[PDB]
């Protein structure tokens, strides 16, 4: 149908906007601490601690399959990155501190993304 196509154009454009959001969030992680999945070869107990692992490469795979229906779903995954790190790692670690800084800096980007998603529909 023409409506299914219109819907698919909206999703594609949402995907375009989320790709730009993802790039901007990932720049706030210059150390690449959150770039890839935590390695289960190197942290064999990880899944005993963290039930829903997340990382920027895994988000990008979902993104490019147009697997985010709305900004809320994308933000859920970003929040998993931060929240998993802040539980697994102690306060006095470079990892925890990197998560705090990503959360704080990403806030600004996500604030304007929400306005853009509502504004453009």
Swiss-Prot record:
It comes from Homo sapiens (Human). It comes from the Eukaryota. It is found in: Nucleus; Chromosome. There is a cross-link at residue 41 (Glycyl lysine isopeptide (Lys-Gly) (interchain with G-Cter in SUMO2)). Component of some HBO1 complex composed of KAT7/HBO1, MEAF6, ING4 and BRD1/BRPF2. Component of the MOZ/MORF complex composed at least of ING5, KAT6A, KAT6B, MEAF6 and one of BRPF1, BRD1/BRPF2 and BRPF3. Interacts (via PHD-type zinc finger domain) with unmodified histone H3. Interacts (via PWWP domain) with dimethylated and trimethylated 'Lys-79' on histone H3. Residues 9-113 form the Bromo domain. Scaffold subunit of various histone acetyltransferase (HAT) complexes, such as the MOZ/MORF and HBO1 complexes, that acts as a regulator of hematopoiesis. Plays a key role in HBO1 complex by directing KAT7/HBO1 specificity towards histone H3 'Lys-14' acetylation (H3K14ac), thereby promoting erythroid differentiation. The chain holds residues 555 to 674 of 1058 of the full protein. Coiled coil: none annotated. This is Bromodomain-containing protein 1. Highly expressed in testis.
């Amino acid at each position: 149908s023409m409506e299914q196509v219109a819907m698919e154009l909206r999703l594609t454009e949402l995907t375009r906007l989320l790709r730009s959001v993802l790039d901007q969030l990932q720049d706030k992680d210059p150390a690449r601490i959150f770039a890839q999945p935590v390695s289960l070869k190197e942290v064999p107990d990880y899944l005993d601690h963290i039930k829903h692992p997340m990382d920027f490469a895994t988000m990008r795979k979902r993104l490019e399959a147009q697997g985010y229906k709305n900004l809320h779903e994308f933000e859920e995954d970003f929040d998993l990155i931060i929240d998993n790190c802040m539980k697994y790692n102690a306060r006095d670690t470079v990892f925890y501190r990197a998560a705090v800084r990503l959360r704080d800096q990403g806030g600004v980007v996500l604030r304007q993304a929400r306005r853009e998603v509502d504004s453009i529909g």
